[PDB]
């Protein structure tokens, strides 16, 4: 709205590697996340196809399509409730203390639903899981929602 | 510019300014090159060095000319700092394809063509991203060691 | 000439120039040979070394004389680079007949007679093309190790 945030246009100049002021359709998922929006990858996929837009063939972009797609994704930020994130992992391990065994969270984050690479899974556990093999998800989900 | 790097440029300024008056003229350039072994140093090379300045080469004109050409110059300890963060387990030289992917995918300065030029005089190990350290040496002091 | 190879020739120039004035004369040659164990070094050997130069042996005359005799001198890391491309799976020394065929059939410098001279002091493994690495050692530093 501007509140006209012109820093979204300045961040588009940091993600366009050619400097022509266009951003390919394959970068739009990760740049919506870097502007403070977490649409799921199936949602980013649907919307695209919904608009008869094929992410399979070469793509370019213009700021005039990327701005309204970020504004259509911005209504879905009401789905980011931290009660359900901590209660999900609280149902994932027994006893009254928030600890996932290391390999349980790593294999679930790579193979269940939207596949996260094991490189990204190791980069999200690095520091929050110590050598006991127990990830405290009270501080883990706190630090994941700090970015 | 750290102060020891500015003292290194002050010592190089005194070795090229053999009249010791504080201004490197064309005779100082030619007599420093002749003392390094250049008996055939043409006057057009000395004129092209003086054509990079708008005035006489005193210490602050030599520092501003080197500042404007070395706007991304990095000391060896900060280049090894960044390469120790790229190899955070220590000792090992990092893979060739890992440095090519991480240069491109993070920044536009790490685009490929430039990566072929990095491999091209920075040899294999250096280019590949396996060794490490020789590239920090030649970025702070050029040519083959 | 890489800069560390030129620093190795500067250190060898300082060990043969025992007067430390920058010019290796015939007395320096004889006193360096006597300090290595040559008590019978003839004056005709010293005169044949000085007869390879047109002037006194200063550092740049010693570098140009070694440059003109070592116009195909290759450091050990680039010889092992080429032998790792000839054995691209790593570890194994390459076959005798494969190096004889690939030297001949690619280039005139790899002709046979020369291949018999390669096997002749570069022993079997080396000659054969099976080992590897000892030949890179003796091409950068001669004689049996």
Contacts of residue A69, defined as CB under 8 A and 6 or more positions apart, other chains included, come to A28, A32, A47
- Asked if B96 and B128 touch (Cβ cutoff 8 Å), the reply is yes
- Long-range contacts of B17-20, Cβ-Cβ distance < 8 Å, separation of 24 or more: none
Distance of CA A115 to CAs A41, A106, A119, A141, Å? Answer: 10, 11, 11, 19
Nearest alpha-carbon partner for C87 in C41, C136, C53: C136
Whether chains C and B touch (3+ CB pairs under 8 A) is answered by yes
- Distance in Å, alpha carbon of C22 to nearest chain B alpha carbon: 13
Give dist(CA B49, CA B12) in Å, integer. 15
Annotated binding residue C21: yes
Which residues of B fall within a CB distance of 8 Å from C1?
A: 144
Give dist(CA A19, CA A21) in Å, integer. 6
Annotated binding residue B2: no
User: Tokens 């050409």 identify what position?
Assistant: B69
Helices (H) and strands (E) counted in chain C, each on its own, are: 9, 0
The DSSP 8-state label assigned to residue B93 in this structure reads: P
Quote the tokens at residue B103: 């240069």
Give dist(CA C46, CA B24) in Å, integer. 44
Contacts of residue B46, defined as CB under 8 A and 6 or more positions apart, other chains included, come to B26, B29, B30
Give dist(CA C14, CA C8) in Å, integer. 10
Sign of CA dihedral B101, B105, B110, B113: positive
Give dist(CA B54, CA B64) in Å, integer. 11
Report the alpha-carbon angle A91-A95-A99, nearest 5.
70
Annotated binding residue B17: yes
The DSSP 8-state label assigned to residue C115 in this structure reads: H
Instruction: Answer whether B144 sits within 8 Å of C60, measured CB to CB.
Output: no
Which residues of B fall within a CB distance of 8 Å from A17?
A: 108, 111
Give dist(CA B89, CA B138) in Å, integer. 24
User: Tokens 């649409």 identify what position?
Assistant: A39
β-bridge mates for residue A126, sequence order: A129
Give dist(CA A131, CA A109) in Å, integer. 20
- Distance in Å, alpha carbon of A112 to nearest chain B alpha carbon: 27
- Distance in Å, alpha carbon of B106 to nearest chain A alpha carbon: 9
Q: Tell me the Ramachandran region of residue A94: left when phi exceeds 0, alpha when psi lies from -120 to 50, beta otherwise.
A: beta
Per residue, the 3-state secondary structure of chain A, as one string, reads: CCCCCCHHHHHHHHHCCCCCCCCCCCCHHHHHHCCCCCCCHHHHHHHHHCCCCCCCCCCCCCHHHHHHHHHHHHHHHHHCCHHHHHHHHHCCCCCCCCEEEHHHHHHHHHHCCCCCCHHHHHHHHECCECCCCEEEHHHHHHHHCCC
| Three-state SS at B28 | helix
Q: Tell me the Ramachandran region of residue B98: left when phi exceeds 0, alpha when psi lies from -120 to 50, beta otherwise.
A: alpha
- Approach to solving: cryo-EM
Quote the tokens at residue A89: 């992992």
Give dist(CA A32, CA A24) in Å, integer. 13
Q: Tell me the Ramachandran region of residue B91: left when phi exceeds 0, alpha when psi lies from -120 to 50, beta otherwise.
A: left
Q: Taking the CB of residue A25, how many other CB atoms lie within 10 A of it?
A: 20
For B57, half-sphere exposure in the C-beta direction (CA atoms, 13 angstrom radius) is 27
Chains with 3+ CB–CB pairs under 8 A to C are B
């Amino acid at each position: 709205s501007k509140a006209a945030a012109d820093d979204f246009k300045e961040a588009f100049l940091l993600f366009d590697r050619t400097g022509d002021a266009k951003i390919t359709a394959s970068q739009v998922g990760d740049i919506a996340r870097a502007l403070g929006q977490n649409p799921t990858n199936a949602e980013i996929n649907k919307i695209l196809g919904n608009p008869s837009k094929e992410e399979m063939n070469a793509a370019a972009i213009t700021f005039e399509e990327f701005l309204p797609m970020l504004q259509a994704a911005a209504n879905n930020k009401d789905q980011g409730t931290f009660e359900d994130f901590v209660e999900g992992l609280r149902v994932f391990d027994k006893e009254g203390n928030g600890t996932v065994m290391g390999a349980e969270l790593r294999h679930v984050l790579a193979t269940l639903g939207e596949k996260m690479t094991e490189e990204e899974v190791e980069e999200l556990m690095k520091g929050q899981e110590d050598s006991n093999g127990c990830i405290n998800y009270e501080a883990f989900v706190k630090h994941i929602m700090s970015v | 510019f750290d102060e020891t790097e500015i003292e290194d440029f002050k010592e190089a300024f005194t070795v090229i300014d053999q009249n010791a008056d504080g201004i490197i003229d064309k005779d100082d350039l030619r007599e420093t090159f002749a003392a390094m072994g250049r008996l055939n140093v043409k006057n057009e090379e000395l004129d092209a060095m003086i054509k990079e300045a708008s005035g006489p080469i005193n210490f602050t004109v030599f520092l501003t000319m080197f500042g404007e050409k070395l706007k991304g110059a990095d000391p060896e300890d900060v280049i090894m700092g960044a390469f120790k963060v790229l190899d955070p387990d220590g000792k090992g030289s990092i893979k060739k394809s890992f440095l090519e992917e991480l240069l491109t995918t993070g920044g536009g300065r790490f685009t490929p063509e430039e990566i072929k030029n990095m491999w091209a005089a920075f040899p294999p190990d250096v280019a590949g991203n396996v060794d490490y350290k020789n590239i920090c040496y030649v970025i702070t002091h050029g040519e083959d060691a």
